Design a protein around this ligand. Structure first.
Ligand code: HEA
Ligand code: HEA
Ligand SMILES: CCCCCCCCCCCCCCCC(=O)OC[C@H](COP(=O)([O-])OCC[N+](C)(C)C)OC(=O)CCCCCCCCCCCCCCC
Ligand SMILES: CCCCCCCCCCCCCCCC(=O)OC[C@H](COP(=O)(O)OCCN)OC(=O)CCCCCCCCCCCCCCC
Ligand SMILES: CCCCCCCCCCCCCCCC(=O)OC[C@H](COP(=O)(O)OCCN)OC(=O)CCCCCCCCCCCCCCC
Ligand code: CUA
Ligand code: CUA
Ligand SMILES: [Cu+2]
Lengths: 121, 269, 59, 236, 102, 534, 47, 77, 45, 60, 51
């Protein structure tokens, strides 16, 4: 109903519940709590050390065998991940379709994958 | 809760848009305009008021979409860094297409440098073809336009820096200069240089100047829309999606005007 | 200002189309297109109905 | 001359320029033929050999030898197919004393050729139209859809210039037999020096749409000797 | 193209060493046949040892058929003869004499 | 249907509309070109009693519909907005309103052309609109204006599509993909968007100038005042030469994709692939005046232009050699997309080398504006537009909709259409090489037999197209019965010849594009978590 | 928008309904495709 | 022409001769319209405009001189 | 130990049937226009 | 630059004021650029052109 | 193929032929005039192509 500080990212309920109070005359408001849209979720996070849409590749070096298959974090039922060898680019681009119950393998790479979603009710 | 909604609306900067009738209605407006013009200029019915109303309603729909494209940026928000970069790149490619239009206009007569052809022209400068030349006639306005752009570019820089009373002063100066420019454009409404009867050399210059008289109107419309928005104070010094557009437009239009003034004025004379 | 936050809260509470800004404008503009453009496109093919049929057959 | 029915090669030559064009054409087509044969046979043998291949060689990516081979071969191939074009352009475009100059204007669905280089009785400029004879009003023994009431004449073993222009719409001066093809701009002139070494009748129609009635565009060129040309000029 | 046989050979035997099931056997054998490198008798013996470890005789039949027809290699036969007989009679996986007359 | 389709804002739900408009327009245009060939079978007014203006208007309609309203809407937009957002993995492309306004601005162009043909005025000056033949001096009435607005709206839709393509592929590309691992079709559409952006405005400006000259009682290119149409021809060809590359390059992308996925082996130097494509795109602008050697330019200008053409030819040869390398030394399953690809590699290459041969500066004296040039471009258009679209459809239809097609029907359709196209287009080189002109309903009495064989080939081609639409119907009505029985292939990549069939159950379809790894088409806003590549 | 299973919802057709057994729709599509050449020929001349 | 007018042409080495008639006509019209007694200074390029140049250009220039609006750029003499 | 080939024998016995078939395919693909030329009344036959 | 441009415009560039009234007997030595057939007039009233500025030429 | 050729044949039969040429006498007159003018000597003087 009124202004919301939303100084912390763990106290915001409703993406549109925050507009971001500004200033009419005087000086420019600080780029902390005066942004309309979900843009604060990334700007304040990277202001305090939280990133959005990480581009970090998975553990390419590890082959992910039966003992220790690699772990991917995705709460969805399905996932789109794959392997390109221990280095960045080794073989032809290829990726798998992990599922919640069963597993999938990388064929020529032999990199066995696994789907790990967060617990849901 | 927070993680799931963050992932489900993070990489999705597109609203679940309602059954928007904008495409069909705008397409219908364009088709009606086209067929009505075709029927009016050479056809069976020469009525003018109805096609004028068709143009008016097309402009109303365009203004409605254009005000929404910035109202939903602040009132609805729901934007990230990527979508801001995309919108800015879209405006850049739009102004690049406009620059390509201007380059085509220039090349329509700028390829005759050393007279490679034989007849129907091929003489730079066109000696003998001396009507009231549209060259050097509006330079009294071009110089003041350069001065105004120079004095308002840094004012708009201070705008985007602070968005304060200095920004209001810069906006007022811009309104005054665009009003002066539209006044001096309309003062040369009918008798600016000449009419097209014979010897088409400055007539192409007149047409090229005339057809670009809508970009300044668009700039004024955006400035007025932003003025109304900030009078409503919906837009703070935050997601200024229109301030960036106007500063990039004023930073490219001065450059293109400089390029226009480089030649076509002191070249060949 | 003093109406941005309340307006956003009401719009979020009432998830309805038409965006609440111009209902009268929408109701004014909706019938105008049908009244004008349809009635101006009908003559385009209604008038040449008698004109149509020019076979121009020669032999 | 007349387009030979069921033909699959160029028309009969009439001038050294046209036969030089033909020579350049066949010289180019030789290398184009060898290239197309190479690629077609490669395709055929690939599809007819590896269609039964059980296991695919999937770890071959570099191929440096073939890379350099077909990176350096096209350059010299293009140079050796372009040199004859350059030399033929140099030889043919040589304006070596065009001895005759006549007007050739593409009017609205007809031609009105004006002969100003020569005269008829005393200093006057000879000009006449070229109207295609209607199909229904055809006289027996003529060529359908093309033959004209009156056409143009030209001396043999001489040099001629065709001054091409237009009146309202762009036309085309398309005479493949005589090796001349220059556009008919509405206001801009063009000079082409056509030298003829062979007698005969050379046909032609405008290779540019002239609106609607362009299905009948008569351009008939008749070659005569010097005494015959003098007799025609005296008659005209 | 000046690639040593020994490194990839040793990789093949070492991957055969920890062949838990037939999937890695299949992938390694397919990769080995993928190159123009005609398999050595030693690597084929190691592959058959892995196949006996995983207990799937069809893998042995398939690899024997692959050895019989993998590359033309100028239609060499006696090399194929020895490379098949040594690994047939080394331990015994009798499979060729049945699919052929059927 | 209006609540979700006529008011749509979803890229997936509008790609199918793109396809439907494409197929309907193609069927109509093939019928009208069938007619056009049918009055060309024998000399005289066999079916068109006089009125050559109608013949010219039908020719213009055929050319414009195939060029701007058939395939450019099909492969650029329809395939682009169904693959590029899907291959990227982003849930939705930015601003689908752009796609919707681009799509919905098509049909009124169709109705304005059909009524422009309907009126007695007609647009019979060719699909090129060279002045003064299209002005009030020659052609009055609204046909010219309607055609001009049609091309304007098509250009606007193309610009919007290119905008969406660029923003989606550059602003929110998925994290795993980077500059050095981007697939090929998207690179093709990106270069296409760049060329489209640099090509559209000059056409828009020039054609607006013609409209203003026709209306404002002035003339900038017409001689009526001192203008010269050479400038307009410069501008029009400056637009036109990029356009063929615009329509052809995504065909290169899809063909490379299918040969990569069917040869079981990777591409041959994808860096070389994108180098060739980018070189072609950038080099297309050096020949702005190469299409009008007949004008009478200087010898140096002609030499520079022919040098530019022969330079342009080289990257195409590099790409052809690359495809040959991809196909060489690999297993091949002779399915119908391979048939289309091989027909491309043959006939497109032969036509392109013929065009390169003609690309001599002084060789337009023999072929320009004759039947030779129509034999030239009919080849490459048919290979890279008709056959490319066929390959894409038969390569994605079983998954993008879940519906398979009768393999025997597909094979016979390919054979019919291939033989028809060959027997139609081959004789026209013989027609042109003699020197017969273009754009005439009636012709001299020399090449009646070649026109007759062309006509019977046209009937063969239209029978093939009817079989194709019957195949479409059967797929749409009998998909579930065809999947269960042996009427169609359900796995395009057969297992490697070492691998057992029971283990193959978990290795169904694995390739270099995500859309093949998806399930049956899910909800439009799929991909809750963006795909990441390690 | 998420209320569609994704089987036949991607096409503006409908198996359900005796109004059109996928024949009238295809007949109409054939008709509209053949309309433009036929009507274009007919308005100024014979078919 | 009796198969012998000039023989070898070496006026302009490059092939294209688009800008050739103006230079070969300005001197002719100047010498003709200055003295008219002896044409010896311009007696070497008789054929450069009669047959080596489009006579349509020549007749257009003559009509323009009659009407006083010359295509080229010369003085009033 | 150079068993069998002698590249020439197998190479010829494979290529020559293939080359002959390819040449025959080209001969037919260029003789069908010739077949039309013959069957059509080119010489009033 | 502005002040010298104004000075040069007011010095010799103001001669176009009297160009409207000029006899058709001392035209500059122009060429085929003009004096050619023009578009027929169907719509409009003012001197066969949209803008009533009879100043460019004295030939109709 | 047989459907295509059959429907082409029937549509051409329905359309009919209305050319006042292509008959033998026209071709013979044409080649007689060509021999009189001696055009295309090293080619084909005969242009018949039909009854
Ligand atoms: C896609 C491009 C395309 C296609 C398919 C065609 C198809 C055909 N074209 Fe045309 N044509 C052009 C592009 C095309 N053309 C262009 C650009 C011109 C320039 C005009 C000019 O030069 O002035 C032209 C001009 C042109 C002329 C010049 C006429 C004249 O000189 O005035 C002729 C003459 O017969 C002709 C014939 C044909 C014939 C017999 C077919 C037949 O093949 C029709 C059968 C069609 C094909 C075999 C392709 C299949 C098409 C489909 C749509 C299948 C539908 C299914 C899918 C698309 C999924 N075309
Ligand atoms: C699909 C559309 C398309 C495509 C792909 C092409 C491809 C090419 N075109 Fe064509 N063209 C048209 C559509 C197209 N064209 C149209 C519509 C016209 C106008 C007709 C009209 O106006 O009516 C036209 C006209 C046209 C002309 C003018 C002729 C005219 O009057 O019509 C020229 C000549 O410069 C030309 C050249 C080329 C070249 C060099 C290619 C090349 O890109 C071909 C690509 C293929 C390769 C070149 C294969 C690779 C070669 C090798 C294997 C290397 C061998 C040689 C070397 C050693 C380098 N085209
Ligand atoms: C069921 C109804 C069947 C009705 C049969 C009618 C046969 C007929 O009409 O005659 C055979 C046709 C004639 O063809 P047309 O075009 O109607 O007449 C010729 C016109 N001229 C030559 C003067 C230009 O000739 C043809 O149509 C010939 C077809 C082409 C040959 C096919 C060969 C196939 C194998 C190769
Ligand atoms: C069907 C297969 C695909 C089409 C191939 C044929 C197209 C070329 C063509 O149909 O050629 C047509 C030319 C005719 O030429 P014409 O001028 O005498 O036709 C005018 C008179 N109709 O030959 C033929 O009739 C060949 C007919 C078959 C001869 C072989 C069997 C003889 C018994
Ligand atoms: C099919 C291809 C037919 C080719 C052809 O019929 O060709 C026509 C030629 C003769 O006609 P023409 O070529 O001498 O005419 C030359 C000048 N225009 O032979 C025939 O009539 C063969 C007739 C066979 C009839 C088969 C049955 C047809 C149905 C008849 C039902 C009534
Ligand atoms: Cu023409
Ligand atoms: Cu013409
Ligand atoms: Cu080109």
């Amino acid at each position: 109903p009124v202004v919301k500080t939303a100084q912390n990212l763990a106290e915001v309920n409703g993406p549109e519940t925050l507009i971001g109070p500004g200033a009419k005359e005087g000086t420019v408001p600080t780029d902390l709590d005066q942004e309309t849209g979900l843009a604060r979720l990334e700007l304040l996070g990277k202001l305090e050390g939280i990133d959005v849409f990480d581009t970090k590749p998975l553990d390419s070096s590890r082959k992910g065998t039966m003992k220790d298959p690699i772990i991917i974090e995705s709460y969805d039922d399905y996932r789109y991940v794959g392997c390109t060898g221990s280095p960045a680019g080794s073989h032809t681009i290829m990726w798998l379709k992990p599922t919640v119950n069963e597993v999938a393998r990388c064929w020529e790479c032999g990199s066995v994958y696994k789907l790990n979603p967060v617990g849901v009710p | 809760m927070t993680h799931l909604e963050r992932s489900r609306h993070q990489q999705h900067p597109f609203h679940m848009v309602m059954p928007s009738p904008w495409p069909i209605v705008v397409s219908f407006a364009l088709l009606s305009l086209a067929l009505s013009t075709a029927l009016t200029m050479h056809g069976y019915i020469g009525n003018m008021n109805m096609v004028y109303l068709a143009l008016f309603v097309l402009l109303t729909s365009s203004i409605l979409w254009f005000r929404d494209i910035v109202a939903e940026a602040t009132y609805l928000g729901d934007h990230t860094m990527a979508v801001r970069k995309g919108i800015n790149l879209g405006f850049l490619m739009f102004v690049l297409s406009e620059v390509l239009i201007f380059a085509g206009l220039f090349w329509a007569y700028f390829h005759s440098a050393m007279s490679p052809d034989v007849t129907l022209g091929a003489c730079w400068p066109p000696v003998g073809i001396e009507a009231v030349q549209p060259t050097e006639l509006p330079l009294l306005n071009t110089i003041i336009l350069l001065s105004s752009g120079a004095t308002v570019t840094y004012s708009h820089h201070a705008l985007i820096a602070g968005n304060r009373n200095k920004a209001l002063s810069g906006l007022l100066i811009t309104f005054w200069l665009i009003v002066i420019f539209v006044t001096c454009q309309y003062i040369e409404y009918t008798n600016a240089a000449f009419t097209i009867s014979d010897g088409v050399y400055g007539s192409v210059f007149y047409a090229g100047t005339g057809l670009h008289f809508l970009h300044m109107v668009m700039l004024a419309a955006m400035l007025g829309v932003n003025y109304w928005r900030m009078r409503n104070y919906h837009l703070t010094a935050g997601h200024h999606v229109g301030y960036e557009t106007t500063i990039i437009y004023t930073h490219v239009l001065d450059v293109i005007w400089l390029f226009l003034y480089v030649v076509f004025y002191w070249w060949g004379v | 200002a003093n109406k941005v936050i309340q307006l956003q809260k009401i719009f979020q509470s009432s998830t309805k189309p038409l965006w609440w800004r111009h209902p009268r404008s929408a109701l004014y503009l909706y019938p105008f297109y049908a009244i004008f453009a349809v009635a101006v496109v009908t003559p385009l093919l209604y008038i040449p109905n008698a004109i149509r049929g020019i076979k121009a057959k020669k032999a | 001359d007349v387009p030979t029915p069921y033909a699959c090669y160029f028309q009969d030559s009439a001038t050294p320029n046209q036969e030089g064009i033909l020579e350049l054409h066949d010289n180019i087509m030789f290398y184009l033929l060898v290239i197309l044969g190479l690629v077609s046979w490669m395709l055929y043998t690939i599809v007819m050999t590896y269609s039964k291949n059980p296991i695919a060689y999937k770890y071959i990516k570099h191929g440096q030898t073939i890379e350099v081979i077909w990176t350096i071969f096209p350059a010299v191939i293009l140079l050796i197919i372009a040199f004859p074009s350059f030399i033929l352009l140099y030889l043919c475009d040589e304006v070596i004393s065009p001895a005759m100059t006549i007007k050739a204007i593409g009017y609205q669905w007809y031609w009105k050729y004006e002969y100003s280089d020569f005269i008829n009785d005393s200093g006057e400029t000879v000009e006449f139209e070229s109207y295609v004879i209607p199909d229904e009003l055809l006289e027996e023994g003529q060529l359908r859809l093309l033959d004209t009431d009156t056409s143009m004449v030209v001396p043999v073993d001489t040099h001629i210039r065709f001054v091409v222009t237009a009146a309202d719409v762009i036309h085309d001066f398309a005479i493949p037999s005589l090796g001349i093809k220059v556009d008919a701009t509405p206001g801009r002139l063009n000079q082409v020096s056509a030298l003829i070494q062979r007698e005969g009748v050379f046909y032609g129609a405008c290779s540019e749409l002239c609106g609607t009635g362009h299905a009948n565009m008569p351009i008939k060129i008749e070659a005569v000797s010097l005494p015959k040309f003098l007799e025609w000029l005296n008659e005209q | 193209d000046e690639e040593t046989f020994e490194e990839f050979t040793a990789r093949y035997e070492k991957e055969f060493d920890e062949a838990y099931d037939l999937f890695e056997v299949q992938r390694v054998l397919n990769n080995c046949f993928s190159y123009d490198l005609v398999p050595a008798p030693a690597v084929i013996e190691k592959a058959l040892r892995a196949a006996r470890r995983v207990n799937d005789l069809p893998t042995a039949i398939r690899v024997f058929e692959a050895l019989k027809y993998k590359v033309e290699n100028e239609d060499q036969y006696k090399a194929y003869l020895d490379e098949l007989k040594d690994v047939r009679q080394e331990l015994g996986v009798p499979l060729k004499e049945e699919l052929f007359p059927s | 249907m209006v609540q979700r389709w006529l008011y749509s804002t979803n890229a997936k739900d509008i790609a199918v509309l793109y396809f439907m408009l494409a197929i309907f327009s193609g069927m109509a245009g093939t019928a009208m070109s069938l007619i056009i060939r049918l009055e060309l079978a024998a000399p005289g007014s066999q079916y068109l009693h006089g009125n050559s203006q109608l013949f010219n208007v039908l020719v213009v309609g055929h050319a414009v519909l195939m060029i701007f309203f058939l395939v450019m809407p099909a492969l650029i937009g329809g395939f682009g907005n169904y693959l590029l957002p899907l291959m990227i993995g982003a849930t939705d492309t930015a601003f689908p309103r752009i796609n919707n306004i681009a799509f919905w601005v098509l049909p009124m162009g169709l109705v304005c052309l059909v009524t422009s043909t309907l009126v007695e005025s007609g647009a019979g000056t060719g699909w090129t609109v060279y002045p003064p033949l299209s002005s009030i001096q020659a052609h009055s009435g609204p046909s010219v204006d309607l055609a001009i607005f049609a091309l304007h709206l098509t250009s606007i839709s193309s610009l919007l599509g290119a905008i969406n393509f660029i923003v989606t592929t550059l602003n929110m590309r998925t994290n795993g993909m980077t500059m050095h691992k981007l697939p090929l079709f998207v690179w093709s559409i990106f270069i296409t968007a760049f060329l489209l952006l640099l090509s559209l405005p000059v056409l828009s400006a020039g054609i607006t100038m013609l409209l203003l000259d026709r209306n404002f009682n002035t003339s900038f290119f017409e001689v009526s005042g001192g203008g010269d149409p050479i400038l307009y021809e410069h501008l029009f060809w400056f637009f036109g030469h990029p356009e063929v590359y615009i329509l052809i390059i995504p065909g290169f992308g899809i063909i490379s994709h299918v040969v990569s996925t069917y040869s079981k082996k990777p591409v041959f130097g994808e860096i070389s692939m994108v180098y060739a494509m980018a070189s072609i795109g950038l080099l297309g602008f050096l020949v702005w005046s190469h299409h009008m050697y007949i004008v009478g330019l200087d010898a140096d200008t002609r030499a520079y232009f022919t040098s530019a053409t022969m330079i342009i030819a080289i990257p195409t040869g590099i790409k052809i050699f690359s495809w040959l390398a991809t196909i060489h030394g690999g297993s091949i399953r002779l399915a119908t997309p391979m048939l289309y690809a091989i027909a491309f590699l043959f006939l497109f290459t032969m036509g392109g080398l013929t065009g390169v041969a003609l690309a001599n500066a002084s060789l337009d004296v023999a072929f320009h504006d004759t039947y030779y040039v129509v034999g030239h471009f009919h080849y490459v258009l048919s290979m890279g537009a008709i056959f490319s679209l066929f390959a894409g459809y038969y390569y994605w239809s079983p998954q993008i909709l879940g519906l398979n097609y009768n393999e025997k029907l597909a094979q016979i359709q390919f054979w019919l259409i291939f033989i028809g196209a060959n027997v139609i287009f081959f004789p026209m080189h013989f027609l042109g090489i003699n020197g017969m002109p273009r754009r005439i309903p009636d012709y001299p009495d020399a090449f009646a037999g070649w026109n007759y064989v062309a006509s019977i080939g046209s009937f063969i081609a239209t029978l093939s197209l009817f079989l194709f639409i019957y195949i479409l119907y059967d797929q749409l009505v009998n998909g579930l019965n065809n999947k269960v029985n042996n009427k169609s292939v359900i796995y395009n990549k057969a297992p490697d010849f070492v691998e057992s069939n029971t283990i193959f159950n978990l290795n169904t379809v694995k390739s270099s594009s995500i859309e093949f790894l998806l399930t049956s088409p899910p909800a439009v806003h799929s991909f809750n978590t963006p795909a990441v590549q390690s | 928008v998420h209320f569609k299973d994704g089987v036949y919802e991607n096409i503006p057709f409908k198996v359900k309904g005796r109004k059109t057994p996928y024949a009238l729709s295809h007949f109409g599509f054939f008709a509209i495709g053949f309309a433009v050449p036929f009507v274009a020929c007919y308005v100024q001349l014979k078919k | 022409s009796p198969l012998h007018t000039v023989g070898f042409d070496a006026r302009f080495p490059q092939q294209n001769q688009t800008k050739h008639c103006w230079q070969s006509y300005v001197d002719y019209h100047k010498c003709v319209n200055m003295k008219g007694e002896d044409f010896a200074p311009c007696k070497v390029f008789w054929k450069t405009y009669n047959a080596l140049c489009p006579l349509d250009w020549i007749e257009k220039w003559d009509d323009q001189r009659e009407k006083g609006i010359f295509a080229g750029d010369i003085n009033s003499d | 130990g150079r068993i069998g080939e002698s590249w020439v024998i197998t190479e010829g016995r494979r290529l020559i049937p293939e080359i002959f078939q390819w040449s025959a395919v080209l001969s037919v693909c260029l003789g069908w226009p010739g077949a039309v030329y013959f069957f059509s009344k080119a010489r009033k036959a | 630059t502005a002040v010298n441009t104004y000075f040069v415009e007011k010095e010799h560039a103001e001669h176009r004021e009297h160009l409207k009234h000029v006899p058709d007997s001392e035209w500059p030595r122009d060429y085929e650029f003009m004096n050619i057939r023009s578009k027929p007039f169907f719509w409009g009233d003012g001197d066969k052109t949209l803008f009533w500025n009879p100043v460019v030429n004295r030939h109709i | 193929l047989l459907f295509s050729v059959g429907l082409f044949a029937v549509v051409r039969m329905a359309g009919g032929q209305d050319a006042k040429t292509m008959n033998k006498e026209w071709q013979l007159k044409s080649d007689e005039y060509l021999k009189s003018k001696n055009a295309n000597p090293w080619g084909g003087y005969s242009q018949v192509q039909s009854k």
